[PDB]
Amino acid sequence: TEVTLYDLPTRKEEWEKKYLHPEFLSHLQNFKDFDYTEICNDVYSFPLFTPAFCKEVIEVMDKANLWSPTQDTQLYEVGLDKQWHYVVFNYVAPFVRHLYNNYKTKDINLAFVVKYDMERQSELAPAHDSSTYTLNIALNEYGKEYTAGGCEFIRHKFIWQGQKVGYATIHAGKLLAYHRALPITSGKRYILVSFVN
Amino acid sequence: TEVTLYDLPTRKEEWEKKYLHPEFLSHLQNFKDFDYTEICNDVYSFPLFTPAFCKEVIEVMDKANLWSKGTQDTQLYEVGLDKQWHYVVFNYVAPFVRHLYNNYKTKDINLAFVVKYDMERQSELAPAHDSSTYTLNIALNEYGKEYTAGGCEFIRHKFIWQGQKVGYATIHAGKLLAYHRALPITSGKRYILVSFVN
Secondary structure, X not given: OOOOOOOOOOOHHHHHHHHEOHHHHOOOOOHHHOOOEEEEXXXXXXXXXXHHHHHHHHHHHHHHOOOOOOOEEEHHHHOOXXXXXXXXXXXXXXXXHHHOOOOOOOOEEEEEEEEEOOOOOOOOOOEOOOOOEEEEEEOOOXXXXXXXXXXXXXXXXXEEOOOOOOEEEEEEOOOOOOEEEOXXXXXXXXXXXXXEO | XXXXXXXXXXXXXXXXXXXXXXXXXXXXXXXXXXXXXXXEOOEEEEEOEOHHHHHHHHHXXXXXXXXXXXXXXXXXXXXXXXXXXXXXXXXHHHHHHHHHOOOOOOOOEEEEEEEEEOOOOOOOOOOEOOOOOEEEEEEOOOEOOOEEEOOEEEOOOOEEEOOXXXXXXXXXXXXXXXXXXXXXXXXXXXXXXXXEEO
């Protein structure tokens, strides 16, 4: 049987091939040549996951229908928290060491999927996150499945729109990257957000 | 009798006149026009305390002789100044932080101590991320007159900061974005007040 989201780290090799973006995967040992973009001071956009990861994550959340000030479901509520912990400590933490002067990842505060729709935009007030760093993955396709949306970095005076499926944004949680989501004008927009200490 | 370091907030008004830099004091309600400098991205230098504050802090630490063995420091709580420092941070520093950093709200104080660098230090000052959301570093004594060299290297910014004025503070992020090391002094003694705030 084909590997599933749940099979990390038991079926590590197969999981990686199916779920991690080939560009990220091929640079695990050498981030010097990895194609990431500094979109504004100290905020990076980079390929992380494949379309298959994103599609399956959305299916799991849609099917669980455990949606909860924003409409979200914690990874622990669908039994994906141990998998996420593995992703963060094994794959993301070395990339953080590279980006941020050898900063060592301590622990995960929160990991959840957010579903923005036309009834549930949230307040969209600016905030500092409860984290040392925040990871934000776009799970579904701009234009095809939603319009407008995106992210405003208040301090940086920078608007980030049209994030690609499976691409991540990373930024400081507290102090230095005050931010808000932007409203969508149609459809549904799904993101995976994690608050890491 | 003249107000002392200990008399905050009992003798708040007299404490402020004696111990807070007049420029900081006069802008407590509106930092818009306060004369602070961005020395590198997101790192600010600004007047905070008077020479009298700095002199008295050093006296208290010199007299207590509670220095860690021989980097050499003493915690403010070891000389009974932790409640005064709490008052300083929540009442004076926190509003300035709200102004500098997009309304960030100060939660709690991790540590507050005085560091004494002298010529007995035998080993290296390694780079570090601090255990804090933000770090406050006050120069307590005078560059050139009382020590040579010293200062602080912001490694990510590739910026060396040296020769801070007495009673002037540096503020920077603790984690992630302001990797740093202290640089050794080559003569005399350098005293600093450092606080790690969450």
